[PDB]
Design a protein around this ligand. Structure first.
Ligand SMILES: [Mg+2]
Ligand SMILES: [Mg+2]
Ligand SMILES: [Mg+2]
Ligand SMILES: [Mg+2]
Lengths: 261, 96, 55, 48
RNA sequence: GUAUGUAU
RNA sequence: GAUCUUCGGAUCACUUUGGUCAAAUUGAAACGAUACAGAGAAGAUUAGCAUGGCCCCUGCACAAGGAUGACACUGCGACAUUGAGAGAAA
């Protein structure tokens, strides 16, 4: 099972900027004139993965608490079949915890300036910042075709004035996963970055409301059944008599009353 | 001449041998001369690069020299100190 | 003084018991015996962090 | 040069401190003219 | 027209 | 496996894994290119020492340098009034 997208792999050797990048043995990079060429100008990927075609069983699937392979989302996981990490999309079951990005890489304090491949653990982002090509208004058919495959979406926005998209996602795991796969692809290469808070008050309140709702759902399992019984009971009653009756009976507090009788 | 002080034996080279980071073996002298002479070459290179001072290159004969030719602003960064140089010229001897 | 080469091994495995306090819920106690040990620092590695200056 | 040993590189400078002490053990052992080669003993940092 | 800083 | 010794039965040996990524664009130096401007002390030229820190480089340095390294503020006020004249509100 599995597909090894490239059996061979890639070996890195270079002399960019022709006359001497030197190479800084301490931190493995080159150093010379034209730093503007290094800031911008990222070159297109050689491969993109197709989900339905490539995905399959792995050695990780047998192990309960694994991660996904980073190279799978890049579409070059030379192992493929006998890969140690999962070769699927992140579902609601997969879970993970706070300081860990879906791919296993640890999170950090507070973002990059240019918004890198991992985000902060102090704020949560289900979103993605992009920079795309603009043929006509069939862009939205193209965007919705590709990004929908990587995960369950909440809402695709596509600003046509500036070729940019704020793509939120249903599961946070898909968002981290989605960014890597989309990034460095053609529809120049798409530019993928973590999203800053969207401008204006109303929109933020709308997002805050969604996050709060998400938290409430998470809490909801936790609360005591009698407390659970109540809010639900009150909504159904929308009852008074029942409440009164309950009050009379009452007259670790619940435990103490239980202990007495 | 002082008459020597009473003391327990410290001995550095048997402390390092007691941690799990050093191992022991027996080889030829000239091998372990080259070993050092190299080790020191790198240990300076990695210092030169960590400072991002990457327009100077040490020759394999512990000889430091600029390539680019620098501004006065780029020279003040170079200005390696009384130690490093002493450490270097002690290597130049070991090499010979 | 950084104590060059002077490397000491506090090499008594410190054993402990840890009584957990119903954190989320569920399993409560058990008591779980932890066994602490000191990983013995490589002699060479220079300082592991910078001197941040804050008012 | 290679990334495979990007860990070590922190220690490698750490060694620098004890280079002058390696020179000195080495020269106090130089083999002497009548010897053809001489075998010695060594401590190495497993880091090389 | 650099020593030394400001902007991309 | 080896040594004793009933084919039972002994005895010797006991839980590895220094990991900031699992495959060098988007998670660990910035400098450089370019443009502008272009060097304290109340004429002009000019040595300097200090001074204060969320500014720092070179230096083994509690020497010394880096333009004297660079950068550096100075309304308020704890409010009385006097005596006269005019105005609007109680
Ligand atoms: Mg001075
Ligand atoms: Mg002057
Ligand atoms: Mg001067
Ligand atoms: Mg001063």
């Amino acid at each position: 099972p599995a597909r090894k997208q490239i059996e061979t792999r890639p070996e890195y050797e270079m002399e960019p900027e022709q006359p001497g990048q030197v190479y800084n043995l301490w931190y493995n990079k080159w150093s010379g004139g034209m730093r503007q060429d290094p800031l911008k100008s990222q070159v297109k990927s050689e491969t993109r993965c197709v989900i339905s075609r490539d995905s399959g069983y792995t050695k990780a699937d047998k192990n309960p608490g694994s991660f996904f392979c980073l190279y799978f989302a890049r579409g070059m996981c030379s192992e493929g079949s006998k890969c140690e990490y999962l070769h699927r999309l992140p579902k609601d079951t997969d879970f993970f915890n706070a300081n860990v990005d879906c791919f296993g890489r640890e999170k950090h304090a507070d973002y990059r300036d240019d918004m890198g491949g991992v985000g902060s653990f102090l704020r949560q982002n289900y979103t993605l910042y992009v920079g795309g090509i603009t043929p006509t208004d069939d862009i939205e058919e193209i965007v919705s075709r590709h990004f929908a495959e990587w995960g369950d979406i909440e809402r695709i926005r596509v600003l046509n004035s500036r070729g940019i998209a704020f793509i939120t996602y249903l599961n946070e795991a898909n968002a981290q996963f989605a960014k890597e796969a989309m990034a460095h692809q053609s529809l120049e290469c798409l530019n993928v970055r973590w999203a800053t808070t969207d401008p204006n008050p109303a929109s933020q309140a709308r997002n805050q409301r969604r996050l709060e709702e998400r938290a409430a759902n998470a809490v909801k399992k936790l609360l005591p059944k009698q407390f659970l019984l109540d809010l639900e009971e009150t909504k159904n009653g929308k009852x008074x008599x029942x409440x009164x009756x309950x009050x009379x009976x009452x007259x670790x507090x619940x435990x103490x009353x239980x202990x007495x009788x | 001449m002082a008459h020597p002080k009473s003391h327990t034996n410290r001995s550095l080279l048997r402390q390092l041998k007691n941690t799990k980071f050093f191992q022991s073996t027996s080889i030829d002298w000239v091998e372990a001369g080259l070993q050092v002479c190299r080790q020191g070459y790198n240990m300076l290179q990695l210092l030169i690069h960590r400072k991002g001072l990457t327009y100077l290159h040490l020759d394999y004969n512990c000889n430091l020299k600029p390539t680019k030719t620098l501004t006065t602003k780029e020279r003040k960064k170079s200005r390696f100190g009384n130690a490093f140089h002493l450490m270097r010229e002690i290597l130049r001897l070991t090499k010979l | 003084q950084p104590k060059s080469a002077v490397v000491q091994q506090r090499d008594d495995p410190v054993y402990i018991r840890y009584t957990p306090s119903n954190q989320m819920g569920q399993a409560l106690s058990k008591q779980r015996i932890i066994k602490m040990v000191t990983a013995e620092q490589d002699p060479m590695e220079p300082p592991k962090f910078r001197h941040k200056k804050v008012p | 040069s290679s990334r495979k040993f990007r860990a070590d590189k922190r220690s490698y400078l750490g060694a620098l401190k004890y280079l002058p002490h390696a020179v000195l053990k080495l020269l106090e052992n130089m083999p002497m003219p009548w010897e053809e080669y001489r075998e010695v003993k060594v401590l190495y940092h497993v880091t090389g």
